[PDB]
Each structure stands twice: as C-alpha cells, then as structure tokens.
Amino acid sequence: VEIAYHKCDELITLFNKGELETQPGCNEEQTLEAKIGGLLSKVREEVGDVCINELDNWNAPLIMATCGSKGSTLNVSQMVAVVGQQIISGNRVPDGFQDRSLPHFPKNSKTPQSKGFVRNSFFSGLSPPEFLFHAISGREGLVDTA
Amino acid sequence: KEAAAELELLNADHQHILRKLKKMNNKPERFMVFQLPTRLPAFERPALAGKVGSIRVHKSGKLSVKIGNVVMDIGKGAETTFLQDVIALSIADDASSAELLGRVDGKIVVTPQI
C-alpha cells in the first residue's frame, strides 16, 4: 500500500511546484481526481483478488460468497484485507472547512488519507478521521431510502 | 512563514520613523499623529496631563518606546495613507477666530506589550 501511497505523494509533488500533462477533460484539479481515484481503486481490487487467493478452505464467509447466500467477494475482502475510498456524490470527500476536510490535516492537502482513504479493515479498527470518512458515506446511501 | 516575513517587514519599515526623526532638523510648522490610550501615572497621579517620555532607539534597529512606569510600551508601524491634502486647524473662538496650523505628514501607532 506504500507503493501507491508514494506514487500519489510524488504525483502531488509534480503538481505543486510544476504542472502535469492534462487529459482530454476540463483542466487540472479535475483530472487530478480521475488519476488519484483511478489509481486507489486498483489497490482494493488487487488486494481483494490476492485475499481470496489466500483465504483458507472450509470457512463460512467464503462459502456464502461462493454461493451468494448473503454477501459477495468485495464484501469478504472489506472486513479482512482493507476498506477503501469512500466515494460520496461521485467524487471524493470535499472540504468541510477552508481548503481542508478536517483540522487534523494540513491546509491544501490533496494527499490520500486526507481527502478520504480508509487504509484499514473492520477487523483491524479505524482511525477517528477515518471513522468520520466512513460515517459520511454511510449516510448518503442511508438517506437515499427517505 | 508569517512570523518571519512579519519581522522582516518590521525591519524594512522600522527605519522609517528613524528616517523621519532626523528629517526636518529645522522647525517649520509640521505635525505627525501619535496614538496611545491607557493613561499611566508613571510616578504618581498629580491631577490627564501626566509626565512621560523615553521613546528612544535600542541597538541593531529597535525603537524602544516605553511609558516610564513599569511597561515597555513598545510598538510602531501604522498604515500609510493614500489621500494627500490634510491640515490642522483650531476653532477655539476667542472673539470668533480660526487658525491654520501645520499640514500634518503621517500617523504611527504606540501599542502596549502583552
């Protein structure tokens, strides 16, 4: 996980003191989210593949995922390997405060784990800004019922 | 970042009252505006008009304005105005008269230290 973390850290380093080559989109600060969200989404899929490649025989969350009793294979890797990238409203978590989401992170920080990337499991336990980032995305789907 | 550039701006605009102080060695009609609240006794209270002084310069460029009681009442560097024409008058009547004093140059703060 530190490989993609260092990749996202180095890609912001080329973004602050310099400038990146853009995509056929709007501009920069819009193609940044498409490259930092399209990169962190591969980490969860890779670890979900290599978790079910590793996971032991004769256990019930794999049998319920093999059948489809109640659950899936992204579901079983989310409580074992890692949770990841709580999307709200299509994009990442926006800033609640001025230029930052929480006061526990420095200003104008677009690094992962600051704009929202839960790098733990449900078995491992969450950090408090990580718990807030999970609790925001658990509301916007819950409010879709009402 | 803000404290370092703050003290460098204070260093860059700290010579300006020392520039103005040796400016105008002769005495025509000029003025400049000082501001200081919180009247101190500074040795005792004889009666508003209290004895005060000591607005000197410490070495390596440090304007050590202080009220003589206890306090290093230190601080200068007020805002530079953009309007130009400004003039002091006096309308204490004394059988209906008026005056025209000194075409005042500028304004600088005197801030207490906490």
């Binding site: 709200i88 978590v93 800033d95 609640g96 405060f97 001025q98 230029d99 930052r100 989401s101 929480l102 006061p103 526990h104 420095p106 449900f122 078995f123 336990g125 969450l126 950090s127 408090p128 800004p129 718990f131 807030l132 999970h134 609790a135 925001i136 995305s137 658990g138 509301r139 916007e140 789907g141 819950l142 409010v143 009402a146 | 803000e2 404290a3 703050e6 701006l9 204070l10 609240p37 919180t38 601080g75 560097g77 007020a78 805002e79 530079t80 105005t81 953009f82 309007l83 304004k107 703060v109 801030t111 207490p112 906490i114």
Partner: protein, 750 residues
C-alpha cells in the same frame, strides 16, 4: 468536565441566566406608563424577583414536583413585583404584589431539587438519577426542543447558476427578523430588494444616499486596485450618470418616494433629508447623528462580496457549515414570549384604569389597581398554553411555530436522555435535494455523527456530543474599547482610499478597524483570552479567501474544549494530571492556568489539531482530549463501533431509546400513562467507557444471553432468532406493561 457540567446544562444554565438577568432586563424597558386623562398616576416597576419575598427565605412553593404530577397540577413559584405609584399624597409606597405564576423547570436555581443528595430525594419521592431539565404543566412533563437557526448578523453569499448569483443578510431588532435579499438581472446590476420598498434600487444611489458621493473611492472601495472588478462594477455607475448624480436632495428623494411603511400615522414627513428612516432601517445599525460612515461602509462591504463571487470559483457561504448556524435555547425562547405577554399585560392595564376612573365619587382611597386577578389569570394562561400546546406563535415578532415542545419520552433510561440533548430542525425543508440533510465533515467535536432518527425525519434533526458547551451572551463595549488599545484604526480617521491594505478587520458583522502588522494582533489578543482576562466566547480567526479577521462576540454557538500544545511539546504536564485526581484543581481551576480554551467551528479552521501525543510536529496549535467524545449519550451504548459499518451504528441509536428497561428508582410510585418494566435486568458485560459516565450500569435495559451463532432448525432463515423454551420458562426477559385509565368527576353549573 462532567462533574460540574453534567451533559444537561443547555436547558439549566439558560433558564438560570434568564431568571438572573433577563427577567430584570425585560422590565428595564417596559416600566413607563401614564394616561392622557389625569396626567398623574404614573407606574414605576422596581426590582422584580422570581419567588423570593425578600423579607423571608423560602415560601409557598414548598410543594415537590411529584405532588405536581399525580394531581394534574402545574409546578410553579409565584413572581413578585414592587410598585411605587402615587394616589393621594404623592408618596411612593412599598408593597409586595404577586402578578403571575411562571412555571419553573426542574433542577434550577429557583427549584427545590437544587442541592439534594440521598435523603431529600427519597423524602420528596423522586429518583436522584434523572437528568431533569424539563417542565411539568397540567400533570404531564414537557421539554423544550432546542432550535437552531442561521447566523443573524452576518452575510450569506449563496449563489445559483441559472438565475443570477444571490447575496443576502438577515438581521434582528430585539424580537423580529426583517430579512433582506437581492437578485441580480441584466448581465450584472446590483440591487437592494427589500420587502418594505417597491421594486428595485441600484447600488450607485444607496452609497450616495448613505455615505460617499466621490465616485472615485467607490471604484476602489468595492473594486480593489486593478485585478478583475473594474469592468464588473463599471456597469453600475452608468445608472448614476443617467438619473441621479448628487446627494440627499435627489438621493433620499429617490428612496422616500418609493419606500412605504407609513404606519397609518405620520404621513406628511416627505422627503428631502427628513424621513431618513429608510436609510436606517436597512440594517440593525441604529444611528442618531450624521455618523453612519461605518454603516455605509458595511453596506459597501455587503456589495463587495457579490462582486468577488463572479470572477472567483465558487466563493460562497453554504447553509450547511455549522459555523454559520447559531441556536436558540429554552431561556432565549421563553424570554420573547414572556416579554410579549408582559407588554400585553401592560396596555391592558391602561384600559382598566379609565374604565372605572370616570368619577364614581373620588379617585384617592383604594390601592389604585384592584383589577389584577383576572389579569393574573391572563398572564399565566399564556405560559401554560405555550408550553403545553406548543404554539409559541404571536403576531408581533413575525413567526408561527408549532412542534417545539414535546412530551418527554420515558421508555428506558436513555430515551429520557435522547429527548434531552436534542437539537431540532429549522427551515429549508429539503424534499429532493440532500443539501441540508446529508452529513458534513464540520461537525467533528459536536453534533454526534451516528445518532440520527432513521425514518422520514432523518438528517434534519440530530444530537449533541459529550464535550459540548453552548454560550448565552457576551458584552460588546469592553471589546470595542479593547481593540482600540490593541491597535486597530477606526474608520473616522483612516477614511482614505488606503483601506484595502491586504487584510482589514471587522467585529461581528460591523466594520471598525483596519490593521497593519496582522499576526501581532491575533497572537497578542489571543494571549489575553488565555490569561484570566476577557474570555469564554471570543472567536479569533483570520481568513484567506476573504481577507479580514473576526472577533465574534454575540453568543449562541458551540465551544468544545481542547488542550494547547507548546512550540515543541504539549501543555499536558503530567504533574497536573496527578494533581487533577488528587482532590484539588478541578476543571474551573484548569482554564485559568492557560491549559485549555473553548475552540469553535469557524475558529478551528485556523488550527492544526493533533490526535495523540505520538504524532506531534511543531506545526500544531492544539491537541484533542479524548477522541471517543464524538459519539454522544445514546450512541455511546454500542460496544466497538469502529469495527461496525456506519448504517449499523445509526440503527442502534433509534433502538437503544426503544428497548424496555429499569426507568427510575421511583418506578413503582408513578402513574405514567404507558410505561414498560422488566423483571430481572442485567448490566452489560462490555461496558463502554462513556456508559459509566452517564450511569447506564445503574439502570440497564436488557439481559445477557449465551448466544450460539449457528444455522439451526430452519426457523431462522431471514433475520428471526430462535429462543429456548426452558429459559423463558425460568424467567428470561419477563415484562410488565403498566397503563393508566384515569377519569375525572366534576360539578356542573347548577
């Protein structure tokens, strides 16, 4: 913190400050009354008190609230007024006069449950573990749900893409609102749309009717120097060079022929420099002389941000950020209705003098009022119908409001603490858009992230956290006096075009100074707060999108506490932690030494807050005390919530206040209309470290069960657990539903 705060203080301290200060402040402005016929007989309301009778200690209101619950009788202590009229020999005579009834909520300063422990609660037949904080009128017990609003004396710059971008500013004149807006049409034309004026007024004449007519500094007062605002604002000065070029003899005449309030009185007052009310009713800044340069420049700063939010990406203030939201407590909500009912008592007392004054034989014997008993019935029938019915709607302060006082929910112990500590829902009803309904990152220390009423009212109402403090009021004269000492420069001597020197400064939505050496002003003034001088509210934060720095002082917003870090360490100082649990140096002796201060929402965006001690860097400004304080009273029942996923924690908060339990100690000496009991309650095996603070282990709401997670018998396919016969047979989870079917018997007219 909870030893002197106690998690129910927003209702207690507000009511105590009401009966301490505002109950005297209302009669400070409503004590002059006379009559046209016989211009003698003046009334003078002198010092008022809530149930004291100053030549005694305590009387009359010896009764407990439990006697006022089984009898269907209100709980109240009578209020007393001394009056100093003149009847025959113009000598001001002293006499104690009871005028009203005024129900007092439980566990207040003027209550009997104050300072009771282990012997007086049992004798007066009441559980010593209930939170209190509620009223009891007509037998039933009722709370006042705390309402939130938007910030009153501010500027909201909420925009729109299809329609032109909007900017508004509400206000308040001591009980009303008088809001104002303006929409923009014709590719940029700033107007002043107000409901008390006809159609549309351009910006170029409002600054000339109120303030500057130079038309040179105006292209720097609202434009800046050079950047992009010149061509944006240049279309607004074409209206002044076409219709109206000079001062009051055309400027106020353009407004006065268009404005209308007209009172059905004071008609021919038009229009030249007289009837200048329409240039003083467009804010709350009341002026007397020709000193409105601060008010004119405040109008000019109201129309500067609408220019700034055209070239800039979004640059808007949203109605979701909880730094833009204040909240009105129970005392602040009962104060306006007591003021309106006292003023209805005032003018109806005028009508009862001349009706019986028309010369029967004389006017110089009796006690000069003699007709207060029906008026004393009228003054208490409004307080007992504003709390019981819930309609606080009066036609003076321009608001109708229903559904603010609810009956206290008594199902378990935590349902009484869920009715307590519960902020309500204001406007922006939000049918389809989930703007004011979704969860925001700004509510970290306050406004608990999981406790939400799942259903049709989800997202609108929410609940506070543990370390939350809400202020009431703070004075304004020794703060504007202190800013002049610290080095601001008032508008009356820096009126030049040198006014936008990169930052500026203004006080609570009123522009006073213009500072140079900015961080010398912020750090030195914040040191005044941390040393024992003026403190407890003062929000100090500078901005970067806008440029000013705010010294906000009007109370009514949230003040969670945090611990300071030093340059390279913290102000923890472990000897103080050892001295804390020794017996001395409580939380009141803990702010005076400069270790903690109450931070805010709109202030903590200028703060870099650390979580733990093992990750400190010298860029921090504060540290947080305990990170589990976001989950409130009801949300704290969940064991290990950071292992569950967020819909599971919300669904329990609507269910912990729903299970049966062990409600109170006087559980069998009360005749509630419906309450559920439980025969053998058991403590939870996994005690959360916050359910020991709120005393959930004293009165629990369930039983431990030796569960076995296995697929068995087929009767548990979809969410339906199977139980043991021989365990219910031995008393697993026995219930007792208890109901009241009371009737009254009364005498008739004959």
């Amino acid at each position: 913190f909870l030893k002197v705060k106690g998690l129910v203080k927003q209702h207690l301290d507000s009511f105590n400050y009401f009966v301490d200060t505002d109950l005297k402040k209302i009669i400070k402005a409503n004590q002059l009354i006379l009559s046209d016929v016989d211009p003698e007989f003046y009334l003078k309301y002198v010092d008022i008190r809530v149930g004291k009778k100053s030549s005694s200690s305590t009387k009359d209101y010896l009764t407990p609230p439990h006697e006022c619950r089984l009898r269907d009788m209100t709980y109240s202590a009578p209020i007393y007024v001394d009056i100093e009229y003149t009847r025959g020999r113009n000598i001001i005579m002293h006499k104690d006069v009871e005028i009203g009834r005024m129900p007092i909520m439980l566990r207040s300063n003027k209550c009997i449950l104050y300072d009771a422990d282990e012997s007086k609660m049992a004798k007066l037949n009441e559980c010593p573990l209930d939170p209190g904080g509620y009223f009891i009128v007509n037998g039933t017990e009722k709370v006042i749900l705390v309402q939130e609003q938007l910030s009153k004396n501010r500027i909201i710059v909420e925009a729109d893409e299809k329609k032109g971008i909007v900017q508004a500013s509400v206000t308040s004149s001591t009980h009303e609102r008088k809001s104002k807006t303006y929409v923009i049409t014709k590719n940029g034309k700033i107007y002043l749309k107000h409901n008390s004026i006809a159609e549309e007024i351009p910006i170029a004449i409002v600054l000339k009717a109120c303030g500057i007519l130079s038309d040179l500094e105006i292209m720097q007062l609202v434009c800046g120097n050079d950047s992009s605002y010149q061509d944006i604002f240049a279309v607004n000065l074409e209206e002044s060079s076409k219709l109206d070029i000079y001062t009051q003899q055309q400027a106020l005449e353009y407004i006065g022929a268009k404005v209308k309030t007209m009172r059905r009185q004071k008609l021919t007052i038009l229009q030249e420099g007289i009837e200048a009310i329409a240039t003083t009713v467009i804010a709350h800044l009341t002026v007397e002389a020709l000193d409105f340069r601060e008010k004119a420049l405040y109008i000019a700063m109201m129309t500067r941000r609408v220019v700034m939010a055209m070239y800039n990406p979004k640059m808007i203030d949203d109605r979701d950020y909880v730094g833009n939201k204040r909240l009105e407590l129970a005392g602040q909500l009962i104060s306006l209705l007591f003021e309106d009912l006292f003023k209805k008592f005032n003018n109806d007392f005028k009508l009862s003098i001349d009706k019986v004054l028309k010369k029967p034989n004389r006017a110089m014997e009796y006690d000069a009022l003699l007709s207060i008993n029906v008026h004393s019935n009228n003054i208490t029938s409004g307080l007992n119908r504003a709390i019981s019915t819930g309609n606080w709607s009066l036609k003076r302060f321009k608001m109708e409001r229903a559904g603010v006082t609810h009956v206290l929910s008594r199902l378990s112990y935590i349902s009484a603490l869920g009715m307590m500590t519960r902020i309500s829902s204001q406007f922006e009803k939000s049918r389809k858009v989930s703007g004011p309904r979704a969860l925001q990152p700004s509510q970290f220390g306050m406004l608990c992230t999981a406790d939400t009423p799942e259903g049709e009212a989800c997202g609108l109402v929410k609940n506070l956290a543990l370390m939350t403090h809400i202020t009431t009021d703070d004075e304004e004269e020794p703060i504007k006096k202190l800013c002049y000492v610290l080095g601001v420069e008032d508008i009356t001597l820096i009126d030049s075009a040198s006014l936008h020197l990169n930052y500026g400064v203004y006080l609570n939505g009123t522009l006073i100074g213009s500072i140079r050496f900015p961080t010398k002003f912020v750090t030195q003034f914040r040191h005044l707060r941390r040393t024992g001088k003026v403190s407890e509210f003062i929000s100090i934060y500078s901005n970067s999108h806008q440029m000013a720095v705010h010294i906000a002082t009007d109370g009514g917003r949230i003040c969670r506490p945090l611990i300071i870090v030093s340059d390279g360490q913290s102000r923890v100082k472990d000897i103080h932690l050892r001295k804390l649990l020794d017996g001395e140096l409580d939380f009141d002796d803990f702010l005076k030494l400069g270790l903690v201060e109450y931070l805010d929402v709109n202030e903590e965006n200028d703060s870099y807050i650390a979580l733990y001690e093992k990750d400190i860097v010298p860029s921090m400004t504060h540290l947080e005390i305990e990170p589990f304080t976001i989950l409130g009273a009801v949300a704290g029942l969940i064991p290990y919530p950071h292992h569950n996923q967020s819909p599971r924690n919300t669904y329990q908060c609507a269910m912990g206040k729903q299970a049966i339990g062990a409600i109170a100690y006087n559980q069998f000496k009360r005749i509630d209309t419906l309450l559920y009991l439980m025969t053998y309650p058991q403590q939870p095996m996994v005690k959360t470290k916050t359910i020991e603070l709120i005393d959930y282990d004293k009165l629990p709401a369930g039983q431990n069960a030796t569960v076995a997670v296995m697929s068995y018998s087929g009767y548990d396919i979809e969410d339906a657990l199977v139980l043991n016969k021989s365990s219910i047979d031995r008393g697993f989870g026995r219930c007792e539903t208890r109901r009241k079917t009371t009737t009254v018997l009364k005498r008739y007219a004959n």
